[PDB]
A paper describes a structure:
In this study, we identified a novel role within the globin superfamily by showing that GLB-12 of [name] functions as a redox signalling protein in the reproductive system. We observed that GLB-12 shows a hexacoordinated haem, extremely low ligand affinity, a relatively low redox potential and the ability to transfer electrons to other molecules in a continuous manner. We found that, by using structural, biochemical and mutational approaches, GLB-12 actively converts O2 to O2.−, which in turn is used as a redox signalling molecule.
The crystal structure of the GLB-12 globin domain, refined to 1.65 Å resolution, further supported our current findings. It confirmed haem hexacoordination, with strong Fe-N bonds with the distal His92 and the proximal His127 residues. As a result, two water molecules are hosted at the entrance of the proximal site (hydrogen bonded to Ser126 OG and to Gln130 NE2, respectively), and four additional water molecules and one acetate ion fall next to the propionate. This exposure to a polar aqueous environment would favour oxidation of the ferrous haem, which is consistent with the low GLB-12 redox potential reported. In addition, residues Phe89 and Phe96 (surrounding the distal His92) are part of a wide cluster of aromatic/hydrophobic residues (Val54, Phe58, Leu59, Val62, Phe73, Phe152) (not highlighted). These could restrict E-helix movements required to achieve a pentacoordinated haem and would thereby limit ligand binding. Additionally, this aromatic/hydrophobic residue cluster creates a tunnel of about 50 Å3 in the globin domain, nestled among the B-, E-, and G-helices. Interestingly, this otherwise apolar tunnel shows a strong negative charge distribution at the solvent exit (resulting from residues Asp48, Asp49, Asp52 and Glu165).
Numbering used by the authors:
A (entry chain A), B (entry chain A): 19 to 166, 182 to 215
The structure:
């Protein structure tokens, strides 16, 4: 895909009002990078501890991990990716750039040897594992149900459609890029 | 993808009411196979004549094509695919089987040498070329605007989301299967 096609799932799964909600709800958050950090700490410590080694935090106490370079780097990168993606979708309506960003990010992960070897739709999809923790943990902050016009049901459904579309496009772009590289 | 995942784009782009509309509007049609036939006749004769050779109708007058085996066979297969897909989506809510059907069909086309050689997202996407003629020609039958509760705008938007999702999933499944086969 070039990115400008009419089949863009971010245009199909989300309408204009949905995209505005994604941006406005994300912006309502105070310290979104801190929330992203807390969720990644849960991912590597509680949910998928195989990821500690990947991020170089297999020895760091939970309390030191945010300072370790690969781990704190990833938190920054993931936060920036969500910042840009929600802005493109919900502010500029740059639907092409939003789709292109997600597929480029999916393809780029093929360089991660852990994922090249272990990413597997039959067994573990690590993009799904990570984003599912966001679905469970980020959405209650976004609805205001948890702390650190739109109804709770609306915000929940929109963020689920959005985050599931991020999973599917990163998964598909990764899988294709890996197949091509062989 | 197994098919049962939460990232299924037919569940994300279409809600239950949308899927019911897809099924009810398709069922309102009198002789849907005839309409499918007429649209394929336009595709091969007027829009993408490179396809005449593929379907063995490079000599048949337009008036004989429906009887030629590869061409009339394809019309039957495409009609059955839409019949099953709209039933799965809109009647049984078998969203897994709907997604699986579309990806299996995408993968199966890699066996078509014309597509293996020529299918190309940079240049011509033949699934997109075919389905776009359906978007232009089938939707006015579905809305009742042309001849052979839901508003015209609703029916048009739902069928566009649906048919665009069929294009994207056939395209992606095809591309992956071709890359794997090499
Ligand atoms: C789940 C959705 C994910 C998103 C949105 C995401 C986002 C990003 C971004 C934006 C970058 C830098 C730009 C780029 O390389 O494309 C990056 C790099 C990286 N990603 Fe991810 N990532 C995700 C999941 C994962 C997973 C499951 C792994 C497991 C290995 C992973 C490992 C890495 C690593 C090691 C880097 C290099 C930078 C670093 O180590 O901090 N990512 N990721
Ligand atoms: C655009 C969406 C399309 C749909 C939904 C579709 C559907 C189907 C189905 C359901 C079958 C039989 C089952 C299977 O093999 O999976 C089939 C076979 C086939 N498809 Fe397609 N098709 C599409 C596009 C195309 C295109 C663009 C070509 C161009 C080569 C093509 C060429 C063929 C051929 C040659 C067969 C074998 C049967 C025959 O020749 O009649 N199809 N297609």
């Amino acid at each position: 895909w070039v990115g400008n096609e009419s089949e863009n799932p971010f245009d199909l799964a989300l309408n204009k009002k949905d995209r505005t909600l994604l941006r406005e709800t994300w912006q309502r958050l105070d310290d979104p990078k801190d929330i992203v950090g807390l969720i990644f700490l849960d991912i590597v410590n509680d949910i998928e501890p195989d990821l500690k080694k990947v991020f170089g935090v297999d020895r760091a106490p939970r309390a030191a991990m945010l300072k370790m370079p690969k781990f704190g780097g990833h938190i920054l990168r993931f936060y920036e990716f969500m910042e840009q993606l929600t802005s493109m979708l919900g502010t500029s309506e740059n639907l092409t750039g939003a789709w292109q960003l997600v597929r480029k990010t999916g393809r780029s992960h093929v360089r991660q040897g852990f994922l090249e070897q272990n990413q597997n739709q039959m067994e573990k999809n690590y993009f799904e594992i990570v984003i599912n923790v966001f679905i469970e943990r980020l959405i209650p902050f976004l609805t205001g149900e948890q702390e650190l016009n739109y109804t709770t049901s609306q915000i929940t459904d929109v963020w689920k459609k959005f985050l599931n579309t991020v999973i599917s496009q990163m998964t598909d772009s990764f899988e294709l890029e890996r197949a091509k590289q062989k």
